[PDB]
Amino acid sequence: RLSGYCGSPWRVIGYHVVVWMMAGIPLLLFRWKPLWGVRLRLRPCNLAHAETLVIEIRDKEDSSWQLFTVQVQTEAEGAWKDVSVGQKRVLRYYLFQGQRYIWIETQQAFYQVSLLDHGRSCDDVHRSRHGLSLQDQMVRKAIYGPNVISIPVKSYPQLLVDEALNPYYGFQAFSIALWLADHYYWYALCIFLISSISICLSLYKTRKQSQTLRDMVKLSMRVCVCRPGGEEEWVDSSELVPGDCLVLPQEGGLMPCDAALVAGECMVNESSLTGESIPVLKTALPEGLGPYCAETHRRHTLFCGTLILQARAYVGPHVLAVVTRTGFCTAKGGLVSSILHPRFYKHSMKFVAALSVLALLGTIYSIFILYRNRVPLNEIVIRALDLVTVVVPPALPAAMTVCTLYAQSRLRRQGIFCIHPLRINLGGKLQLVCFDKTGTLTEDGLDVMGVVPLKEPRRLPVGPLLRALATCHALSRLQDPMDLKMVESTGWVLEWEPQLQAMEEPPVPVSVLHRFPFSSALQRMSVVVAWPGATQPEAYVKGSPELVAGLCNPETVPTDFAQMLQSYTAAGYRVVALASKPLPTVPSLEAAQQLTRDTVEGDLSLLGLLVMRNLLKPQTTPVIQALRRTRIRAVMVTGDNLQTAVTVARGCGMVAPQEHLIIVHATHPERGQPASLEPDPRSRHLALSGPTFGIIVKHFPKLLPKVLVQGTVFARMAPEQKTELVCELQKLQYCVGMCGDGANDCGALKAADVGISLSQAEASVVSPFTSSMASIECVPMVIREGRCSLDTSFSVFKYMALYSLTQFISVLILYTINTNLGDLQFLAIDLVITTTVAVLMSRTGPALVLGRVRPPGALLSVPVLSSLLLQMVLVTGVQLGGYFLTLAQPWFVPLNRTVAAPDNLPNYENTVVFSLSSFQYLILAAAVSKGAPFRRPLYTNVPFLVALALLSSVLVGLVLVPGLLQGPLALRNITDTGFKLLLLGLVTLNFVGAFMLESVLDQCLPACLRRLRPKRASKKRFKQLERELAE
């Protein structure tokens, strides 16, 4: 998807400002097709190099953005050899998608900023940065910009206009303004106050989100820069530019920006980028090859936001380092920069066409008053607008808001502490969930089962093994998690030497005299002891099994230690050797006093082996089984090695189909992906790797949809590629559930429609939902809550549509003769019946049984529409029949059809219609809520039946006994006759008919019959799955 740039500078004053001022009022059309708007402003045709208002052309792009160039304080090919030194003839830059874009006079075009990797910078000229040169420092600071993540504040004045113009937000305002013309102020205030409260709450939530996002990212530290002279000074982290000599302190913390090592090595603790916390050795970069692509040297480049544990000095005053990536183009900036700026119509057009048809149905009947009635002399303008706006209820968006906030409160009662009610209705339609082995799926700590070899619960064996195991702790427990777990497993308690005494030994304690230091070059940790227990002391040292085995030639060597090691490595186990060497007391005293290491490490003897396991939570397996039972496909994404991820997935027990992995090969312009095994078709599932996933992005000749559909386990996934994977998965109209606890998946969580974070910090800031529990058992609960919310929203929408249609038809029938159903009656029908019913019908939740059928994802199913149409025809037909019956029957006095105003309210025509229509809303409210399949049984939840019974009883009383409420309400007394009995019989027969219709339609018996056999392919996945399943 290519793009271009065009623009022109501001014009002189004159008629241009007049026309710009003119565009103030008619800019309502600027939302769509901005080409006319931009061409109607001060944007003439000029050169491509003297442009000021940069805009994007319509080169296979939609919704072009707009930006303003930033002025420059002062004005005056080798693939960007670094065209930027000094002051050029003209300097212009602008902000776009984070990193700014610089202008190059020689290229005559806007060249996107790229690192030295794109320019193919040779290594011969590198490795020579000994601090800042004589070149001006401000030039680099200005061109690259500050090393701070800029996030707009988005205050109230610049935020209201952005999120105060929605389709159902202008119509509501028009309806509110309409009421002031013809009284009815009581209803307007109720909507106005709730709308204002909702707007204020939304603004406050947006402001809080912006504030917490801005405060989350910030750099405040002082770094040391090695000057080329003979002095060093401290500088802030906000003035870091590439090509600067960085000095790493021996006890440094976080990494303000990316840097490359040139001398020495230092341990790293990458935790915000990779799930595994194993330290990685990063050495210098002595090389003389060609271009440095910064892709094949991951073992020498430090990423931003990485903690350093220990650093080793080298020859010279101190270690040296260089800066190669900083600003918005660094690793940390890229993840953040991909969130701020970056984030069918068939049903919408059908709905708008239906609304237009409904509006034009009544638009001509209203003007027909001149035919069968006397015109009110230009008073129909207000009446016509009222009829137009009554076709839908102004509180339609608010109808589901009560259900959404009730569901949010129910969730907040226990488990997830929701912050704002949103994205709940769409959360029920969940079919895939992403999990990571570390953090949530497995315990963070490392547990040791014990020593397998002897040449089960602890304390069983007797001998020097217990002393060796319990004394190997070089660092005292009290004055990493693995050491704590190891010391806890043995069951002992720890806290000549001050605080180096052992407990739980029947004999005198074995006290360690000195502890050897840990070094990167040497992985040996030896401990020397000496005790008066009339036994020769022993020396214990731990290290890699290979080294001890190789250097244990003089003594006995292990047998059959290769195949076991390979199997353990393939299974994810880590093998560590426990070497030992006896030493008498006298030589040991001198060895400890003189700090001798060569003499004690010359010969050793292994005693046992130790391994670690993830120790996954037991509660995970039932949750996974329940999730899979509902035809939900589970996928695993993690940055750990594929060897551990595959075995963890296999040990989960969810399912064991054929498993194969793609083997990575040497780099090549054309790459082939072969198969593997643990040609005959089977149920094997695809499993990609890290490099292959990133290589497939550039070209996708085939297997693009066929891979993600069967994708099961992904390993070594980069933090940036997770967003791309989420976008690719969502391109097929699919819902992806991103779950994690680290900060390396914030972009994926934001992109994903629904996500769960198990950490109170980091992911909690951006994740829509925050979980206070460290277990994955909440996903089924969230899915059930979303499904229940969607069902309740659908039921509420159906009820609101039915009520609106009934009200519109009742108004239309009465419009034939001069009537308006009064004012108090209308106010009661609106406020009382609607509010008391809608709220009470949306306070139910799912049961403890998980089903298989999932709710429809849209309100386009034919059964519901057919049922609604049948109900509408039935109600209108019964109303017409009742009107005909009451008209043919001889009544007391003819209606006064002289005055065309609501002054003759007392009459027999309005009384028989208002009361008859009142029961319809209550009847329909109790026949639109689903029962057994999704909601709880109706009888169990009975806050609403009592209210409905009371309302029906009071309505029957007021429509039976004269003088009860006929004074204030526009009702007329009726002589005691058999009309009431006939009305009650009609109501009862309609009730039973509607109930029978609902009961028969709920089973959806005709659905299967009508499904034989129109092929349905309204999906991007089922069509390909059908073809795949053929073979």
Ligand code: ALF
């Ligand atoms: F292994 Al993770 F987020 F914990 F990728």
Ligand SMILES: [Mg+2]
């Ligand atoms: Mg995680």
